[PDB]
From Swiss-Prot, chains A, B:
Transmembrane segments: none annotated. It is found in: Virion; Host cytoplasm. Interacts with capsid protein VP0, and capsid protein VP3 to form heterotrimeric protomers. Five protomers subsequently associate to form pentamers which serve as building blocks for the capsid. Interacts with capsid protein VP2, capsid protein VP3 and capsid protein VP4 following cleavage of capsid protein VP0. This is Capsid protein VP1. Forms an icosahedral capsid of pseudo T=3 symmetry with capsid proteins VP2 and VP3. The capsid is 300 Angstroms in diameter, composed of 60 copies of each capsid protein and enclosing the viral positive strand RNA genome. Capsid protein VP1 mainly forms the vertices of the capsid. Capsid protein VP1 interacts with host ITGA2/ITGB1 to provide virion attachment to target host cells. This attachment induces virion internalization predominantly through caveolin-mediated endocytosis. Tyrosine kinases are probably involved in the entry process. The chain holds residues 624 to 849 of 2184 of the full protein.
Amino acid sequence: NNHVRSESTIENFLARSACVFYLEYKTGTKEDSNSFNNWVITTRRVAQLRRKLEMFTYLRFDMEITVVITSSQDQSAPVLTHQIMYVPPGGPIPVSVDDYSWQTSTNPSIFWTEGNAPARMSIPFISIGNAYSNFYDGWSHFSQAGVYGFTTLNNMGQLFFRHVNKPNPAAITSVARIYFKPKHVRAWVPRPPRLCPYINSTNVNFEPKPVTEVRTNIIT
Amino acid sequence: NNHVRSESTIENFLARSACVFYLEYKTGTKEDSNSFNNWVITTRRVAQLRRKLEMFTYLRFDMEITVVITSSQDQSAPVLTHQIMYVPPGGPIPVSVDDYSWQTSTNPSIFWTEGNAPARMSIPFISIGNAYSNFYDGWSHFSQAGVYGFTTLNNMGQLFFRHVNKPNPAAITSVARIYFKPKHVRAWVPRPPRLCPYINSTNVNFEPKPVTEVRTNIIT
Amino acid sequence: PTMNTPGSNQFLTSDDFQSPSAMPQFDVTPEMHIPGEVRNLMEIAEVDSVMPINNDSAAKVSSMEAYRVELSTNTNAGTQVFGFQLNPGAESVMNRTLMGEILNYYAHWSGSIKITFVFCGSAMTTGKFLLSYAPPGAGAPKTRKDAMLGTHVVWDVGLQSSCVLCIPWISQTNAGFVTCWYQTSVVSPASNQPKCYMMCMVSACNDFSVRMLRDTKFIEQTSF
Amino acid sequence: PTMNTPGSNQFLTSDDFQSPSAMPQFDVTPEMHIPGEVRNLMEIAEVDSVMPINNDSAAKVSSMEAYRVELSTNTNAGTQVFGFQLNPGAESVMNRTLMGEILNYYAHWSGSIKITFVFCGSAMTTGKFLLSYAPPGAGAPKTRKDAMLGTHVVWDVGLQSSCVLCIPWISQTNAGFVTCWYQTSVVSPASNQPKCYMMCMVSACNDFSVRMLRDTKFIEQTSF
């Protein structure tokens, strides 16, 4: 080298795209069991991602969500249009393919057609708190008897997906895979790295593990 | 906070996209019953939208209409072209698939082909009045004996839709869904919020309702 | 550097760009000045409105009994008349009022609000009431003695015909309480029905803030 | 000149462009100052951490024996106690420490590190140890005589309760060695168990650099 480093900035230690989920849904009537599908935004799903966001106790960031979507027919039509709807937390949600929760005016939605560069949009920092909390040590209720940890803290919206075309002969099944990255990170208060494999996706519960590998003898 | 708010500006309380209609039409001859379809522009169709535009007595705005359109064939060709025609109020209108009202030179029209970003265009403020009226208290005729409320006030054009290709074997059915948002709103004179569910789409008619929920007793 | 970067083809609702115009000729109607103009929704959140206090089961269907609370000579000192949770947007006593209805279009808000009491009895009636306020995270007083030791304003009816309490620190159970208590029984001139009434009004006070739009819960779908 | 040049349509992960915003209205929560802020990952690489030295087979399952090494009066002068390869990121004696764990997120790093010895015995115990360092590309000393002729610091316990060696020229077998040797046997006051202990701590020193991110090897996939 010849100057101060800049590959170990907080902004470059984070802010890398990663797969976080994928899901399926297929053309069909509202009767059909799977014909819309949803994913709740959380960063605790993927172990690798989770590790690097438990380096810090508090974070605030905007995030970008890009969905890349493919489709294939199955054994024996016009180009399909897909709708991706973001529901901010505390909004209405659909329970079926046809509802007035897809017609609601306060839920952002992206209409996108195949053969175009994949849809994306950013979601700005949302929370009444001044940072997301990656550790919490309280209860939901005002007397201790609530739910321990991750209560109303770390609550973000959720996506929904459906086809926008009418059903037509021959089912089409789509697979949409979600990529996620934060941007404009700021971190406050560091933590020691996690040492034990994750168990639950909502608790810090762990099974005891050895600190380190054995050696053949301490002397050289 | 630390400064004056700006999420409760009139411009951000309105000016959000919302679904307002959708309709269907299909390839076919002029004999065929459904082969073109229309929608009259009004903002009283959707209850949720209607609520927030009856907050004020007078409004003036430009509007943007985006139509997102999908299509599917049905059981047993080149890319289809769709025409969306705006007819300003007091123009000629078609009564069938083939007329000289699609060939008229004074009606804006958008030709659009599938596999492109959805068509849109704005319509500028149109009315001889200096504001739209969301409440009116007169009659159409110069002596009271006309039609009460919403007469020649709140009259805007209407859209028409058809395929531009010739009919060909195997029907294609399209579904076009309309999104609408105003922009550059200005409001004058506020109103108290509506309390009773809407009945007619052209009257302020209502059925009496309780003011508020019951309580178990007024004392704590 | 390119113009075909990911997410450049898509229609995203609530994203602003320019758009071509259907008529780039006609567009012309000159604006005129019109009395009264609203440019912010906190200009109609600071307007007083009569809140309903009395809720029975038909004293709020016919609702001209909903806005007023009985008083009598019969009642003895140190018994409360009304009281409420004090939490607009979730307590039906002030969430269908003009001010309260604006806060159902947002999630998370803060500021202060001010309530107003108005005695509407006769001009020869005189009494004394002890108004009281409990901080959030503390139960309602159970006695006039308890209430008195809290924050309280002794409001003499027969001098003042109204009182304004400006209550800080509201935001959204835990939340304060407002309670009114007899300190003395009302003194009638000679009235043979001892019915005297008081109303209550509410409005947002000074600074107020809201964030993050969402749709109201009080209208359900289309039906036509 | 055109905007449709090869590679203008594609989604490339780790490529930065602007993107439209879902809500271009709400976005507002004012930042507040919060004590402690990290802006670089070398601000937590220069913090001391207790490294485990003692590794047996159950002196590291229950690991409160993992961080400390026995000493005794029984042992004779000129026998070594511990020693290690000195190569953080591949030697399990300091690669699961706070400092060492940061260097498993990068490939190729350099700088200097400094180790610290702390004697935690009684306040009447006195001995002398000969600490030693071997340059990279030379085997560990085989005798205290050999060690002495190398680089060595005679550390008197009974004056100093700690010593810091700052070892330059680490980067990634060949690599140095650190070894500790008795020079004298410990002198007990009258203690009937001659157990005395010493711990060791490690941290990066001054300038340090890393390049080229990669994923850690210590967590394996999802499982829920």
